[PDB]
Coordinates of C-alpha atoms in Angstrom, one line a residue:
Chain A
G1 CA 12.7 8.9 51.8
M2 CA 16.4 8.9 51.5
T3 CA 17.2 6.2 53.8
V4 CA 20.2 3.9 53.1
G5 CA 17.5 1.0 52.8
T6 CA 15.9 2.9 49.8
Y7 CA 19.4 3.4 48.1
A8 CA 20.4 -0.3 48.8
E9 CA 17.0 -1.5 47.2
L10 CA 17.3 0.7 44.1
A11 CA 21.1 0.8 43.7
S12 CA 21.0 -1.9 41.0
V13 CA 18.5 -0.1 39.1
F14 CA 20.2 3.2 39.2
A15 CA 23.3 1.6 37.9
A16 CA 21.4 0.0 35.0
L17 CA 19.9 3.2 34.0
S18 CA 23.2 5.1 34.2
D19 CA 24.2 3.9 30.7
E20 CA 23.1 5.4 27.5
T21 CA 23.5 2.1 25.9
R22 CA 21.3 0.2 28.2
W23 CA 18.6 2.9 27.6
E24 CA 18.9 2.2 23.9
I25 CA 18.5 -1.4 24.5
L26 CA 15.5 -0.8 26.8
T27 CA 13.7 1.5 24.2
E28 CA 14.0 -1.3 21.7
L29 CA 12.8 -4.0 24.0
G30 CA 9.8 -1.7 25.2
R31 CA 8.8 -1.3 21.6
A32 CA 8.9 -5.0 20.6
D33 CA 10.2 -8.3 22.1
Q34 CA 13.5 -8.9 20.4
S35 CA 16.4 -11.5 20.4
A36 CA 19.9 -10.8 21.5
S37 CA 20.8 -11.1 17.7
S38 CA 18.2 -8.6 16.8
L39 CA 19.8 -6.1 19.2
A40 CA 23.3 -6.8 17.8
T41 CA 22.1 -6.2 14.3
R42 CA 20.6 -3.1 15.4
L43 CA 23.3 -1.4 17.8
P44 CA 26.9 -0.9 17.5
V45 CA 27.4 -3.2 20.6
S46 CA 29.1 -6.6 20.5
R47 CA 27.0 -9.6 21.1
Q48 CA 28.9 -10.5 24.3
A49 CA 28.3 -6.9 25.5
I50 CA 24.6 -7.1 24.7
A51 CA 24.4 -10.4 26.7
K52 CA 26.2 -8.7 29.7
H53 CA 23.8 -5.7 29.5
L54 CA 20.7 -8.0 29.3
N55 CA 21.9 -10.0 32.4
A56 CA 22.3 -6.7 34.3
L57 CA 18.8 -5.6 33.2
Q58 CA 17.2 -8.9 34.0
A59 CA 18.8 -9.1 37.2
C60 CA 17.4 -5.9 38.4
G61 CA 14.0 -6.5 37.1
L62 CA 14.0 -4.0 34.1
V63 CA 13.7 -6.9 31.5
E64 CA 12.4 -10.4 31.3
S65 CA 13.3 -13.2 28.9
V66 CA 10.4 -14.5 26.6
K67 CA 11.1 -18.1 25.6
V68 CA 8.6 -19.4 23.2
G69 CA 9.4 -22.9 22.1
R70 CA 13.1 -22.7 21.4
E71 CA 13.2 -18.9 20.5
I72 CA 14.4 -16.6 23.1
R73 CA 13.4 -12.8 23.1
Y74 CA 13.5 -10.1 25.6
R75 CA 10.9 -7.5 26.8
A76 CA 11.3 -4.3 28.8
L77 CA 9.1 -4.1 32.0
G78 CA 7.7 -1.0 33.5
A79 CA 7.4 -2.2 37.2
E80 CA 10.8 -1.0 38.4
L81 CA 10.6 2.1 36.3
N82 CA 7.4 2.7 38.0
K83 CA 8.6 2.0 41.6
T84 CA 11.7 4.2 40.9
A85 CA 9.5 7.1 39.7
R86 CA 7.2 6.8 42.9
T87 CA 10.3 7.0 45.1
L88 CA 11.9 10.0 43.4
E89 CA 8.6 11.8 43.5
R90 CA 8.2 11.1 47.3
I91 CA 11.8 12.5 47.9
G92 CA 11.3 15.3 45.5
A93 CA 8.1 16.3 47.4
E94 CA 9.9 16.3 50.8
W95 CA 12.6 18.6 49.4
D96 CA 9.8 20.8 48.0
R97 CA 7.9 20.9 51.4
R98 CA 11.3 21.5 53.1
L99 CA 12.1 24.5 50.7
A100 CA 8.5 25.8 51.5
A101 CA 9.4 26.0 55.2
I102 CA 12.5 27.8 54.6
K103 CA 11.0 30.3 52.2
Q104 CA 8.2 30.8 54.7
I105 CA 10.4 31.5 57.8
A106 CA 12.4 34.1 55.7
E107 CA 9.2 36.1 55.3
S108 CA 8.5 36.1 59.2
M109 CA 8.6 39.8 60.3
Chain B
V1 CA 16.0 13.3 22.1
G2 CA 18.6 14.4 24.6
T3 CA 16.2 12.8 27.2
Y4 CA 18.2 9.7 27.6
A5 CA 21.6 11.4 27.9
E6 CA 20.0 13.5 30.7
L7 CA 18.5 10.5 32.4
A8 CA 21.7 8.5 32.3
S9 CA 23.4 11.3 34.0
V10 CA 21.0 11.6 36.7
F11 CA 21.2 7.9 37.4
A12 CA 24.9 7.9 37.1
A13 CA 24.8 10.7 40.0
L14 CA 22.3 8.8 42.1
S15 CA 24.1 5.4 41.5
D16 CA 26.9 6.4 44.2
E17 CA 26.3 5.9 48.0
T18 CA 28.5 8.8 48.8
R19 CA 26.2 11.1 46.5
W20 CA 23.2 9.6 48.1
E21 CA 24.5 10.5 51.5
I22 CA 25.2 14.1 50.3
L23 CA 21.7 14.4 49.1
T24 CA 20.3 13.0 52.1
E25 CA 22.2 15.6 54.1
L26 CA 21.1 18.5 51.7
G27 CA 17.5 17.1 51.6
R28 CA 17.2 18.0 55.4
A29 CA 19.2 21.3 55.2
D30 CA 21.3 23.3 52.5
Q31 CA 24.9 23.3 53.7
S32 CA 28.3 24.4 52.7
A33 CA 30.9 22.0 51.5
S34 CA 32.8 22.5 54.7
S35 CA 29.8 21.3 56.6
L36 CA 29.4 18.3 54.5
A37 CA 33.1 17.4 54.9
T38 CA 32.6 17.9 58.7
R39 CA 29.8 15.4 58.7
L40 CA 30.8 12.8 56.1
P41 CA 34.1 10.4 55.7
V42 CA 35.2 12.0 52.7
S43 CA 37.5 15.2 52.2
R44 CA 36.5 18.6 51.4
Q45 CA 38.0 17.8 47.9
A46 CA 35.9 14.7 47.4
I47 CA 32.8 16.6 48.4
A48 CA 33.5 19.2 45.8
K49 CA 34.0 16.5 43.1
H50 CA 30.6 15.0 44.1
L51 CA 28.9 18.3 44.2
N52 CA 30.2 19.0 40.7
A53 CA 28.5 15.8 39.4
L54 CA 25.2 16.7 41.3
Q55 CA 25.3 20.2 39.8
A56 CA 26.0 19.2 36.3
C57 CA 23.0 16.8 36.2
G58 CA 20.7 19.4 37.9
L59 CA 20.1 17.7 41.3
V60 CA 22.0 20.3 43.3
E61 CA 22.6 24.2 43.0
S62 CA 25.1 26.4 44.7
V63 CA 24.0 29.6 46.2
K64 CA 25.9 32.5 47.8
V65 CA 24.5 33.2 51.2
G66 CA 26.4 36.0 52.8
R67 CA 30.2 35.3 52.7
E68 CA 29.8 31.5 51.9
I69 CA 28.5 29.0 49.2
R70 CA 25.8 26.8 50.3
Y71 CA 24.5 23.8 48.3
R72 CA 20.7 22.8 47.9
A73 CA 19.0 19.8 46.7
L74 CA 16.5 20.4 43.9
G75 CA 13.3 18.6 44.0
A76 CA 12.4 19.7 40.5
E77 CA 15.0 17.5 38.8
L78 CA 13.8 14.5 40.8
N79 CA 10.2 15.4 39.6
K80 CA 11.2 15.7 36.0
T81 CA 13.1 12.4 36.0
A82 CA 10.1 10.8 37.7
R83 CA 7.6 12.2 35.1
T84 CA 9.9 10.8 32.3
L85 CA 10.0 7.4 33.9
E86 CA 6.1 7.5 34.4
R87 CA 5.7 8.2 30.7
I88 CA 8.0 5.4 29.4
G89 CA 6.8 2.9 32.1
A90 CA 3.0 3.6 31.2
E91 CA 3.8 2.6 27.5
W92 CA 5.5 -0.7 28.5
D93 CA 2.7 -1.5 30.8
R94 CA 0.1 -0.9 28.2
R95 CA 1.9 -3.2 26.0
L96 CA 2.4 -5.9 28.6
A97 CA -1.3 -5.6 29.5
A98 CA -2.4 -6.0 26.0
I99 CA -0.1 -9.3 25.5
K100 CA -1.5 -10.9 28.5
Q101 CA -5.0 -10.3 27.6
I102 CA -4.6 -11.7 24.3
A103 CA -2.3 -14.6 25.3
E104 CA -3.8 -15.5 28.7
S105 CA -7.2 -14.2 29.4
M106 CA -9.6 -17.0 30.7
Chain C
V1 CA -17.8 -31.7 21.7
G2 CA -19.1 -35.0 20.0
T3 CA -16.5 -34.1 17.4
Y4 CA -13.5 -35.1 19.8
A5 CA -14.6 -38.6 20.6
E6 CA -15.0 -39.2 16.8
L7 CA -11.7 -37.3 16.0
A8 CA -9.8 -39.4 18.7
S9 CA -11.2 -42.8 17.1
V10 CA -10.2 -41.7 13.5
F11 CA -6.8 -40.9 14.7
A12 CA -6.6 -44.0 16.8
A13 CA -7.4 -46.0 13.5
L14 CA -4.8 -44.1 11.6
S15 CA -2.1 -44.4 14.2
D16 CA -1.2 -48.2 13.4
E17 CA 1.2 -48.8 10.4
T18 CA -0.4 -52.0 9.2
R19 CA -3.8 -50.5 9.6
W20 CA -2.6 -47.6 7.4
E21 CA -1.3 -50.1 4.7
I22 CA -4.7 -51.8 4.7
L23 CA -6.7 -48.4 4.3
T24 CA -4.4 -47.2 1.5
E25 CA -5.0 -50.3 -0.4
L26 CA -8.7 -49.9 0.0
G27 CA -8.4 -46.3 -1.1
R28 CA -7.0 -47.7 -4.5
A29 CA -10.0 -50.1 -4.9
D30 CA -12.6 -52.0 -3.0
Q31 CA -11.7 -55.5 -2.0
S32 CA -12.5 -58.6 0.1
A33 CA -10.5 -59.6 3.1
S34 CA -9.2 -62.4 0.8
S35 CA -7.9 -60.2 -1.9
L36 CA -6.3 -58.0 0.8
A37 CA -4.2 -61.1 1.9
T38 CA -3.4 -62.0 -1.6
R39 CA -2.2 -58.4 -2.5
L40 CA -0.6 -57.2 0.8
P41 CA 2.4 -58.4 2.7
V42 CA 0.1 -58.8 5.9
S43 CA -1.5 -61.7 7.8
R44 CA -5.1 -62.8 7.8
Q45 CA -5.3 -62.3 11.5
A46 CA -4.1 -58.6 11.1
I47 CA -6.6 -57.8 8.3
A48 CA -9.4 -59.2 10.4
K49 CA -8.4 -56.9 13.4
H50 CA -7.8 -53.9 11.5
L51 CA -10.8 -54.1 9.2
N52 CA -12.9 -54.2 12.3
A53 CA -11.1 -51.1 13.8
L54 CA -11.4 -49.3 10.6
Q55 CA -15.3 -49.9 10.3
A56 CA -15.7 -49.1 14.0
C57 CA -14.4 -45.7 13.5
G58 CA -16.2 -45.1 10.0
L59 CA -13.3 -45.0 7.6
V60 CA -14.4 -48.3 5.9
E61 CA -17.7 -49.9 5.1
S62 CA -18.4 -53.4 4.1
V63 CA -20.5 -54.0 1.3
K64 CA -22.0 -57.5 -0.2
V65 CA -21.2 -57.7 -3.8
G66 CA -22.9 -60.8 -5.1
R67 CA -21.2 -63.8 -3.3
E68 CA -18.5 -61.7 -1.7
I69 CA -18.0 -59.1 1.1
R70 CA -15.9 -56.3 -0.1
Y71 CA -14.6 -53.4 1.8
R72 CA -14.7 -49.6 0.6
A73 CA -12.7 -46.8 2.1
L74 CA -14.9 -43.9 2.9
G75 CA -13.2 -40.6 1.6
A76 CA -16.2 -38.6 3.2
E77 CA -14.8 -39.5 6.7
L78 CA -11.3 -38.1 5.8
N79 CA -12.8 -34.9 4.4
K80 CA -14.9 -34.4 7.6
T81 CA -11.9 -34.8 9.6
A82 CA -9.8 -32.6 7.5
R83 CA -12.4 -29.9 7.7
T84 CA -12.7 -30.1 11.4
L85 CA -8.9 -29.7 11.7
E86 CA -8.8 -26.9 9.4
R87 CA -11.4 -25.0 11.4
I88 CA -9.5 -25.6 14.7
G89 CA -6.4 -24.8 13.2
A90 CA -7.5 -21.5 11.9
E91 CA -8.9 -20.6 15.4
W92 CA -5.3 -21.3 17.0
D93 CA -3.6 -19.5 14.0
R94 CA -5.8 -16.4 14.7
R95 CA -5.0 -16.3 18.4
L96 CA -1.4 -16.6 17.5
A97 CA -1.2 -14.0 14.9
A98 CA -3.1 -11.6 17.4
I99 CA -0.5 -12.2 20.2
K100 CA 2.4 -11.7 17.6
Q101 CA 0.9 -8.5 16.2
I102 CA 1.3 -6.9 19.8
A103 CA 4.3 -8.6 21.2
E104 CA 6.6 -8.6 18.2
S105 CA 7.6 -6.5 15.3
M106 CA 5.9 -7.3 11.9
Chain D
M1 CA -0.8 -42.0 0.9
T2 CA 2.8 -43.1 1.2
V3 CA 4.3 -45.0 4.1
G4 CA 6.6 -42.1 4.2
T5 CA 3.5 -40.0 5.0
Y6 CA 2.7 -42.4 7.6
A7 CA 6.3 -42.3 9.1
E8 CA 6.2 -38.6 9.4
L9 CA 2.6 -38.2 10.6
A10 CA 2.8 -41.3 13.0
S11 CA 3.6 -39.2 16.2
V12 CA 0.9 -36.7 15.5
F13 CA -1.9 -39.5 14.8
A14 CA -0.8 -41.1 18.2
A15 CA -1.1 -37.7 19.9
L16 CA -4.5 -37.1 18.4
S17 CA -5.8 -40.6 19.4
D18 CA -6.8 -39.6 22.9
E19 CA -9.9 -37.5 23.7
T20 CA -8.2 -36.1 27.0
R21 CA -5.4 -34.7 24.7
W22 CA -8.0 -33.0 22.5
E23 CA -9.5 -31.4 25.7
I24 CA -6.1 -30.1 26.7
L25 CA -5.4 -28.9 23.1
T26 CA -8.7 -27.2 23.2
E27 CA -8.0 -25.3 26.5
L28 CA -4.5 -24.4 25.1
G29 CA -5.8 -23.0 21.8
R30 CA -8.2 -20.5 23.8
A31 CA -5.5 -19.4 26.3
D32 CA -1.9 -20.2 27.1
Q33 CA -2.1 -22.1 30.6
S34 CA 0.2 -23.6 32.9
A35 CA -0.1 -27.3 33.9
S36 CA -1.5 -26.1 37.2
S37 CA -4.1 -24.1 35.3
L38 CA -5.1 -27.2 33.2
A39 CA -5.5 -29.4 36.3
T40 CA -7.7 -26.8 38.0
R41 CA -10.0 -26.8 34.8
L42 CA -9.8 -30.6 33.9
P43 CA -10.6 -33.8 35.8
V44 CA -7.0 -35.0 34.8
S45 CA -4.2 -35.5 37.3
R46 CA -1.0 -33.3 37.2
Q47 CA 1.1 -36.4 36.5
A48 CA -1.3 -37.2 33.5
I49 CA -1.3 -33.7 32.3
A50 CA 2.5 -33.7 32.3
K51 CA 2.9 -36.9 30.3
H52 CA 0.1 -35.4 27.8
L53 CA 2.0 -32.2 27.5
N54 CA 5.4 -33.9 26.9
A55 CA 3.6 -36.1 24.1
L56 CA 2.0 -32.9 22.5
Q57 CA 5.3 -31.0 22.5
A58 CA 7.3 -33.8 21.1
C59 CA 5.2 -33.9 18.0
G60 CA 5.0 -30.0 17.7
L61 CA 1.1 -29.7 18.6
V62 CA 2.0 -27.6 21.6
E63 CA 4.9 -25.2 22.7
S64 CA 5.9 -24.0 26.0
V65 CA 6.0 -20.2 26.6
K66 CA 8.4 -19.4 29.5
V67 CA 8.1 -15.7 30.9
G68 CA 9.5 -15.4 34.6
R69 CA 8.5 -18.0 37.1
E70 CA 5.8 -19.0 34.9
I71 CA 5.8 -22.0 32.3
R72 CA 2.7 -22.0 30.1
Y73 CA 1.6 -24.0 27.1
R74 CA 0.1 -23.0 23.8
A75 CA -1.7 -25.0 21.2
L76 CA -0.2 -24.5 17.6
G77 CA -2.3 -25.1 14.4
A78 CA 0.8 -25.8 12.2
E79 CA 0.6 -29.7 12.6
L80 CA -3.2 -29.5 12.3
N81 CA -3.0 -27.8 9.0
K82 CA -0.4 -30.1 7.7
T83 CA -2.5 -33.1 8.8
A84 CA -5.5 -31.7 7.1
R85 CA -3.8 -30.9 3.9
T86 CA -2.6 -34.5 3.7
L87 CA -5.9 -36.0 4.6
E88 CA -7.8 -33.7 2.1
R89 CA -5.4 -34.9 -0.7
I90 CA -5.9 -38.6 0.4
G91 CA -9.8 -38.0 0.5
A92 CA -10.0 -36.3 -2.9
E93 CA -7.8 -39.2 -4.5
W94 CA -10.1 -41.8 -3.1
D95 CA -12.9 -39.9 -4.7
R96 CA -11.2 -39.5 -8.0
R97 CA -10.4 -43.5 -8.1
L98 CA -14.0 -44.2 -7.1
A99 CA -15.3 -42.1 -10.1
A100 CA -12.7 -43.7 -12.4
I101 CA -13.9 -47.4 -11.3
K102 CA -17.5 -46.3 -11.9
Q103 CA -16.5 -45.4 -15.3
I104 CA -14.6 -48.7 -15.9
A105 CA -17.6 -50.6 -14.7
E106 CA -20.0 -48.8 -17.0
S107 CA -17.8 -49.7 -20.0
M108 CA -17.6 -53.5 -19.1
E109 CA -19.5 -55.6 -21.6

């Protein structure tokens, strides 16, 4: 389940989710659509850093822009968190099955 | 919660291709650090540094087997992380579905 | 949906400036095509054409008054139009509010 | 009922002067829809739908809603409400003036 293809496909998500500040942004954006200037007013992160985090989050599919008329807001999306979660379950299940084989053969008289 | 600090650490550990390679190895069989250094293009020292990061976030544990230390990959941490992401994603998905229904339903 | 053919005709009538100018003057008081010419900076040709359009969409009616024909603005037709827009507007504002109550923080 | 009222409302009156634009507004007031969606629903060409949408956006009766690959449109009540306020005022004034004339005529000897 760990193939290099999986890692290459999820690498940008893993990188995105490796930062506490990005989780802070995601949590905000999963609660209510917000502008970058809403986020800047809330968090101790500069407007330019927020822009960079938002671009990284949109590029890997964790955030989408929502532009209504002239107003630009952002929204967190579950699709990539769900995909990541399914992959981490499948890999966790294989490690578990593997561990069960080893425990079982340690018992063989 | 400390939940986001722990998520960030796990993804920081997974984000590195060398750690992914180590976990791929361990996935298939628990191994000593010397074994991993024999198999991979990094030094015994680099392996110990990666292993420390993998242990510190709960993805690997060391275990003394006879006269040697082995490392094992821990499914429980992948399952816990997955369950957290499923919770969070289900709420974002509920909200998206609600928005699209009121905004777009034909 | 008979409403929208009639809405469109009312707005087509209101959409021309010189026709607006005539209509406003009638709203002040009924008058003949003659008195409209005397009172307004407009041609007799334009009055004839716009009075026809205003009548054909129901915003004005002609009345025989002794030996003259006068034209009267029909505030009922404005009120019916305003009431229709207010209903429609209300139905669009409710959908907007609903979307908003889900999508953004109130 | 000033010529300033006309100057500002002129583009709205023009937009509302076409039954096809009313049909497009009715659809967009019930559901945000793409131009493609509208063309599936109405016997109007995509070119015509595009021109009408441009017209409706320019006077503020519709806004675009852009989320992903998707561009949709939404009817907004705001200009309808402003127009209705103005027509209601004008109608009420005509009624007042008519009543005042009736009293003048009754007092004529």
